[PDB]
Paper text:
The asymmetric unit in the Bar crystal contains two molecules. With the exception of the positions for the first 25 residues, those of all other main-chain and side-chain atoms are well defined. Non-peptide electron density near Lys75 was fit with an aldimine bond between the Lys75 Nζ and the PLP C4A. The Bar molecule contains two domains: an N-terminal (α/β)8 barrel, which contains PLP, and a β-stranded C-terminal domain. Two Bar molecules associate to form an AB-type dimer, and their positions are related by a non-crystallographic two-fold axis. The subunits have essentially the same fold (root mean square deviation (RMSD) = 0.219 Å for equivalent Cα positions). In conclusion, the determined structures of apo and L-Lys-liganded Bar present the internal and external aldimine linkages, respectively, as well as the anchored substrate in Bar. Two water molecules contact the PLP O3P in Lyr and Bar, filling the space occupied by the tyrosine and PLP in SpAlr and BsAlr. The Bar A393Y mutant exhibited detectable, although reduced activity towards L-Lys (55% residual activity).
Numbering used by the authors:
A (entry chain A), B (entry chain B): 26 to 409
Write the structure that this text describes.
């Protein structure tokens, strides 16, 4: 993890980093071009860059976004917003979650379109913009798919009521209506899409809104790819920009690898144990590799006696408890593993692969749960 | 997570952070003074500040270190070392894990004492020292307690030879011998302590080393507090500095809390579901608070339908899957919860406590496996 950085930018190199996240510029640009080709100019692309470009580094990723002429960017935090703007990007910038009031106030300076899900919230936010003499562009969130997270519940009369109240705020300008799908299943997306079509219709008619000044947007990566009719005015794709999307969609390239270094290989006698609480017993005279990565680097404890890594193409297993900063792996069967060798914690190496699915199985949850936190806990390096 | 920072220091505030880590200065200073008094001047104190000071911020902790005259600091990465030096620390700086060779080389500039646990590594390390015209002070790691992680196995004859080989390197100046305990258990500790004493005797004799020019150190926090005969010349304390140690040792104060904000509270009708995959069903008309923290902030997916948070001192349950950036909690029983309210994710709030124990139970591993990543993924703010 760099302790000095400038708008998402570090001064580290692979040589002086204990572990690093490698981000492929050309995989990114390929996935952008692919998505653009799939939209075929019928819908527009908004790149979802929350969680610091999903752990890829918003400051690394932005120059590709600008290069490919992407017109819309979605972020979550104020620092992400600040970095988007400092990169020169001048287009539509929207937050894809509710902000707290004081967080929202601090982001007025970035001309961000803010998300609104409540009459009370809308009232509070309206007062903040009034105080600063700004008109704040807002996307009203609807609970059409049923996340019950950011959105107003338009399947009740109370909801429709809050929705009119929201449209009555003098210093808010409603520029969009959105929802978010709760389940990556085509049937369930279509149920949600039908609900979203009815509820936006109802609003636009009954609150006398201009359909032509509104961007209607519902689709994430899955929906965009699997349910074209969910494309509407604009799509919000995160995972597919990064090659983390529908497994069958192999036209999207993986933009990230997670790597470290062998510091040294050591000889340990049979009967020796490894790591805290001695959870692994050596059944033969071993050679153990000491790798400069641990759970403080996001290589989570749960990988204890479960993980595999790649060195020189070989699939080598983790032994003992993962330490804070150090990981032991068994290279008894791989005499070619040397101090200085590159390790692959996630990705591909010379014919070997550590897969998304093997990691999700160990972790008990989706990979973004690990990689968003890899990206924070280690320096990112743009390659390709 | 700040995307600009200068030597572990950021320009963010509680008011513009979606979530943050509060580090208590006075807890840190209390813990140092207590440690020092307990060591009663009989043994040297080396503050282990690995993993960005265990998630507390090495740039935030250093001034206390310097002021209380701690003479030794232990770190893992080059950035930590760089920061320790930038803060005006001029004393003994030791790495407590093996570095890779190019990592080690980039660190020469911080006059850090390096760990060594191999003849091969030693020779390799000898050659870099040579090439740079430096004598590198080294600590030699011994596998006395059987971590089988960093140290030479002195329980074998090849081990002993490797050891003697290490002491033979012309550009390496051995200043210390160390080991690390594998089990937090008094008896297990004494077993390892007896072995360390024998094996250090053996080595001092056979290498003809000046005992009085050597520091012997084995003890971390548990050993230091629980087995005083393990204190030797110098201890290496991590958790105790931060109040994460033996649960009965309550003289050490918790230095960290993990907090966030309520963005808004929403109404949703019975039978609505919450979050991705609809994993929680509202059994009553509900008020759901939207909290601006998620797994990309280190609030791990495992807390789904499991975590509790504090708002206005109330113990409030997490409902649904934790999103990347947003967490939903049920505030139907708690009408005093409003947009703006401060949420405690870990720590104390007005009579409520989210404990180390309860979080370790949901996580399936020790709390450091969470908080070192909280610290990377969020702004650290110094209080008290």
């Amino acid at each position: 993890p760099p302790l000095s950085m400038d708008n998402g930018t570090n001064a580290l190199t692979v040589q002086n980093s204990n572990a690093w996240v490698e981000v492929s510029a050309s995989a990114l640009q390929h996935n952008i071009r692919t998505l653009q080709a799939e939209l075929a100019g019928k819908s527009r692309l908004c790149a979802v860059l929350k969680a610091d470009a999903y752990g890829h580094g918003i400051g690394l990723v932005m120059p590709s976004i600008i290069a490919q002429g992407v017109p819309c960017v979605a972020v979550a935090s104020n620092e992400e917003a600040r970095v988007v703007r400092a990169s020169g990007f001048t287009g539509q910038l929207v937050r894809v979650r509710l902000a707290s009031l004081s967080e929202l106030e601090d982001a007025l300076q970035y001309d961000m379109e803010e998300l609104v899900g409540s009459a009370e919230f809308a009232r509070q936010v309206d007062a903040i913009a009034a105080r600063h003499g700004k008109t704040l562009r807002i996307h009203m969130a609807l609970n059409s798919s049923g996340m019950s997270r950011n959105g107003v519940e338009m399947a009740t009369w109370s909801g429709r009521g809050e929705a009119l109240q929201i449209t009555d705020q003098k210093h808010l300008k409603l520029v969009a209506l959105m929802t978010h799908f709760a389940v990556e299943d085509k049937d369930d997306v279509r149920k949600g899409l039908a609900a979203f079509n009815e509820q936006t219709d109802w609003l636009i008619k009954h609150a006398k809104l201009d359909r032509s000044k509104l961007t209607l947007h519902a689709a994430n990566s899955f929906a965009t790819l699997e349910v074209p009719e969910a494309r509407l005015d604009m799509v919000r794709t995160g995972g597919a920009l990064f090659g983390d999307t529908v497994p069958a969609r192999t036209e999207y390239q993986r933009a990230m690898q997670f790597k470290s270094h062998v510091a040294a290989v050591h000889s340990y006698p049979a009967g020796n144990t490894v790591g805290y609480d001695r959870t692994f017993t050596l059944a033969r005279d071993s050679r153990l590799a000491n790798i400069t990565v641990g759970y403080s680097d996001g290589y989570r404890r749960v990988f204890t006696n479960k993980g595999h890594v790649l060195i020189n193409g070989h699939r080598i297993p983790v032994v003992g408890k993962v330490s804070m900063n150090t990981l032991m792996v068994d290279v008894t069967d791989f005499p070619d593993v040397k101090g200085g060798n590159e390790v692959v914690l996630f990705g591909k190496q010379a014919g070997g692969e550590i897969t998304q699915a093997e990691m999700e199985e160990i972790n008990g949850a989706l990979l973004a749960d690990l990689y968003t936190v890899w990206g924070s806990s280690n320096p990112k390096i743009l390659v390709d």
